[PDB]
Design an enzyme around this catalytic site. Structure first.
Site, short mmCIF file in Angstrom:
data_model
loop_
_atom_site.label_atom_id
_atom_site.label_comp_id
_atom_site.label_asym_id
_atom_site.label_seq_id
_atom_site.Cartn_x
_atom_site.Cartn_y
_atom_site.Cartn_z
N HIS A 2 -4.36 2.50 11.46
CA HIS A 2 -5.40 3.35 11.65
C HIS A 2 -5.92 3.05 13.04
O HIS A 2 -5.85 4.16 14.01
CB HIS A 2 -6.45 3.71 10.81
CG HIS A 2 -5.93 3.92 9.60
ND1 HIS A 2 -6.92 4.52 8.73
CD2 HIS A 2 -5.04 3.79 8.84
CE1 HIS A 2 -6.42 4.96 7.53
NE2 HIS A 2 -5.25 4.55 7.57
N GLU B 235 3.66 0.65 12.72
CA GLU B 235 2.30 1.25 12.99
C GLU B 235 1.47 -0.09 13.35
O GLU B 235 0.47 -0.21 13.97
CB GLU B 235 1.82 2.09 11.79
CG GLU B 235 2.18 3.57 11.80
CD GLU B 235 1.66 4.21 10.87
OE1 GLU B 235 1.32 3.62 9.65
OE2 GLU B 235 1.83 5.35 10.76
N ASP C 98 -5.13 -1.38 6.09
CA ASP C 98 -4.54 -0.71 7.13
C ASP C 98 -5.49 -0.63 8.23
O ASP C 98 -5.07 0.49 9.07
CB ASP C 98 -4.29 0.89 6.32
CG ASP C 98 -3.15 0.62 5.18
OD1 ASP C 98 -2.78 -0.44 4.76
OD2 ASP C 98 -2.89 1.79 4.96
N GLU D 295 3.99 -2.39 4.90
CA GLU D 295 5.19 -1.49 4.83
C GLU D 295 5.55 -1.37 6.32
O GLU D 295 6.52 -1.67 6.54
CB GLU D 295 4.58 -0.31 3.90
CG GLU D 295 5.90 0.53 3.88
CD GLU D 295 5.24 1.91 2.95
OE1 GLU D 295 4.29 2.35 3.48
OE2 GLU D 295 6.05 2.46 2.31
N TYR E 159 12.96 8.91 3.86
CA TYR E 159 11.76 8.25 3.74
C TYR E 159 11.77 6.82 3.96
O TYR E 159 10.99 6.28 4.91
CB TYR E 159 11.12 8.47 2.53
CG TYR E 159 10.94 9.92 1.87
CD1 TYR E 159 11.19 11.02 2.93
CD2 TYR E 159 10.70 10.36 0.50
CE1 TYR E 159 11.12 12.31 2.47
CE2 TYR E 159 10.61 11.54 0.20
CZ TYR E 159 10.80 12.64 1.08
OH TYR E 159 10.69 14.05 0.64
#
Length: 719
Positions: free
Chosen positions: A474, A552, A470, A548, A630
């Site tokens: 981040h 982001e 990730d 996912e 969600y």
């Protein structure tokens, strides 16, 4: 302009405390001077896994190494013609009775092994690798001169195996029900087959046909020892290749290219002066005596330059990206001619004048938040979400010549408070600070490291960041925030801010080996055309890499672009632009599905989003429940001008709203309401705007920026 150039070669040890990652690659050739990738399609090769079942997926072949079942261990091939589909039963929340997940069966279609490995497990080593390939060597533990080299390459149409002093053995978990040697039919009671070409058929469904090509100086003499094993009569030295025959009409095609195999590839990329860019794969091969046949993904077909390749009709299903098509040629050039025009602001920078006062009222209240409470969280992830949401406000107030949000005093407070909240991260003094790792050549959060290194001994801490999960997610938030600060005030802590931010960028997206401190393209896959999130898994990523959140990931490359703009770095700006374009292309091929999508069955396409995406499976769910808000909401935040104006198309947003979200949105009593309604502003800003004045905001979302984004839609009006 060459896009594959370093950001810098600043030594990150001057900014982050040095460590050597405690979890080492077990099977890596440590003497080759190459860096083991953490988020690559080849990454499972370097580590053990339960029963050795972790897959490596060049595609269209799925591979497993020394997996424990079925007989003598070796290189196991699965080529999934069909998927196993499963459904979640309908609930009031998710009432649509379609399919939820897609998986590929774990079975040995065909395995290359040796008779010598009947009672010993081969040593293994990844002897060399690049972005597109890895060479895996299997050898007899007592005798390193008895070995097989497998060049494993993205898209390869055959499996290639260079045998050295080993007795070849081919086995299946299916029955092998026919063998034709050198294109001759044999009798039903024949059990030995000799020659240099073997066409074999299994009793699976649908029926698999494989062709074995023996290219060594001596022929093979294969005995069918039971239903599922062909065993050579003596040790062999030479190259053996096996290909799945997708259909009878392609046999001559596979025959013709049998002597040429890929060994790796070199990637390059350039921007032009017409708002376009391209990337080129130059495949490495053993020779040029025959055509190179390479399987390509759907998004390759729609972006490839047809001037130096030929398309075939030969197709096989990929693991999770739909059908692949074989292309002829040693070189591919992929083009993106429509790069995003988005920079800092919505395309219409100033909101409708009737909303200016309202928006200013909300901006002031949001800026009056406690920034420490909302940006100094236990972890970097939720802290980053907070930093970026306040960065948006400093940004629009300090570009008031464009936004018409004019308030000099508040503009100063917004930037001052942002600076003060950000400063601890810049100084590496936050709750979960970073370390520079000399082994995998990247930065890692402290929290997931052993206690002796100041961590928690829990490798899942910080969402796996310490084991390289990730980072794009981040660090995207921090890069966007840093770019905004540096853009608005280029003087503030400039030298350190540049070094720190470019380190975060280089960790995720270093494009050049000449950067000696960071692995290249940690989170980007040039063949798949998208990012991977999942990092190091000690006992194997059993479904391969995962991803996912598309937004982001987008947010990282947007931030990289913003940093390029803030520093006048055209190659960085253009590379980020290219990756955003490729991202947009693969998103609609594989992840966000419009009616008519051909890469998934109908009952998956109607889900509109793929859910959690793996190399080997897909799952229409989340890790915290199966509410529609969600599952779909994750693909809607952070909402930035990049996501809103370029990535999320009105056609997709409207189909998704129509079929899934419109029905539940007014019933959502949670911060996901803010997420859905800001998404809704893409298509119906007039109705979204009053909703956003009253529903709850995501923790990375502000009411004022939400109203701003909504009121800058060209079709906004008051209601």
């Amino acid at each position: 302009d060459d896009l594959f150039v370093p950001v810098s070669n600043f030594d990150p040890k001057s900014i982050f405390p040095e460590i050597k990652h405690p979890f080492e690659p077990m099977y890596a050739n440590t003497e080759n001077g190459k860096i083991v990738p953490t988020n690559s399609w080849i990454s499972n090769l370097f580590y053990p896994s339960a029963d050795n079942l972790a897959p490596t997926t060049p595609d269209p072949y799925t591979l497993r190494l020394l997996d424990g079942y079925g007989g003598n261990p070796g290189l196991t091939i699965r080529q999934p013609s069909a998927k196993v589909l499963g459904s979640y039963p309908p609930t009031n929340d998710v009432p649509y009775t379609d399919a939820g997940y897609m998986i590929n069966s774990v079975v040995v279609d065909l395995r290359l092994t040796s008779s010598e490995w009947s009672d010993v497990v081969p040593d293994r080593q990844v002897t060399d690798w690049d972005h597109l390939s890895a060479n895996l060597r299997l050898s007899t533990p007592q005798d390193s001169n008895s070995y097989i080299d497998f060049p494993i390459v993205r898209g390869m149409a055959y499996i290639t195996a260079n045998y050295n002093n080993l007795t070849p053995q081919f086995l299946s978990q299916h029955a092998i029900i026919s063998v034709e040697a050198d294109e001759k039919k044999s009798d039903d009671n024949t059990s030995t087959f000799s020659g240099r070409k073997f066409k074999i058929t299994m009793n699976d469904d649908p029926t698999s046909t494989f062709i074995i090509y023996s290219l060594g100086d001596k022929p093979l003499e294969l005995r069918k020892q039971d239903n599922s094993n062909l065993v050579a009569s003596k040790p062999y030295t030479g190259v053996i290749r096996v290909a799945k025959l997708p259909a009878p009409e392609f046999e001559t095609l596979l025959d013709a290219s049998r002597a040429v195999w890929p060994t790796g590839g070199d990637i390059s990329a350039r921007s032009d002066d017409n708002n376009g860019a391209s990337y080129t794969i130059k495949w490495k091969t053993n020779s040029n005596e025959a055509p190179l046949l390479t399987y390509a993904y759907a998004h390759h077909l729609t972006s490839i330059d047809d001037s130096n390749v030929k398309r075939t009709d030969m197709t096989l299903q990929s693991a999770t990206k739909g059908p692949m098509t074989a292309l002829v040629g040693n070189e591919w050039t992929l083009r993106e001619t429509e790069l995003s025009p988005v920079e800092w602001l919505p395309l219409q920078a100033a909101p409708n004048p009737t909303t200016i006062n309202e928006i200013m009222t909300e901006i002031n209240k949001d800026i009056a938040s406690n920034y420490t409470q909302e940006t100094a969280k236990e972890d970097n992830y939720f802290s980053g979400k907070g930093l970026q949401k306040f960065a948006m406000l400093a940004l629009i107030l300090n570009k008031s010549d464009q936004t018409q949000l004019r308030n000099p005093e508040l503009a100063q407070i917004a930037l001052d408070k942002l600076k003060a909240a950000f400063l601890p991260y810049l100084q590496n003094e936050q709750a979960d600070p970073f370390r520079y790792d000399t082994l995998y050549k990247g930065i890692v959060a402290k929290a997931g490291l052993p206690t002796s290194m100041g961590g928690t001994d829990d490798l899942s801490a910080e969402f796996g960041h310490s084991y390289y999960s990730d980072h794009h997610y981040h660090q995207g938030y921090f890069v966007v925030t840093a770019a905004i600060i540096h853009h608005l005030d280029p003087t503030w802590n400039a030298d350190r801010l540049k070094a720190w931010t470019e380190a975060l960028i280089r960790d995720v997206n270093n494009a050049n080996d000449g950067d000696e401190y960071f692995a290249a393209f940690r989170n980007w896959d040039w063949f798949a055309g998208h990012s991977w999130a999942g990092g190091i898994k000690p006992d194997g990523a059993l479904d391969g890499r995962d991803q996912e959140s598309v937004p982001e990931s987008v947010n990282f490359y947007w931030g990289a672009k913003l940093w390029g703009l803030a520093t006048g770095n055209t190659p960085l700006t253009k590379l980020a632009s290219l990756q955003l374009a490729v991202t947009k292309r693969t998103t609609y091929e594989y992840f966000w599905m419009l009616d008519g999508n051909k890469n998934r069955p109908e009952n998956i396409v109607r889900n509109k989003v793929i859910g959690i995406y793996f190399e080997q499976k897909t799952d229409y769910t989340t890790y915290f429940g199966r509410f529609l808000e969600y599952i779909h909401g994750i693909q809607q935040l952070p909402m930035t001008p990049e996501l809103m104006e370029y990535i999320r198309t009105p056609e997709f947003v409207s189909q998704e709203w129509d079929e899934k979200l419109g029905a539940i949105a007014p019933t959502v009593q949670s911060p996901w309401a803010g997420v859905l309604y800001l998404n809704y502003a893409i298509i119906n800003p007039a109705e979204a705007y009053p909703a956003l004045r009253k529903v709850q905001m995501d923790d990375g979302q502000t009411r004022s920026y939400s109203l701003y984004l909504t009121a800058t839609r060209p079709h906004f009006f008051r209601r």
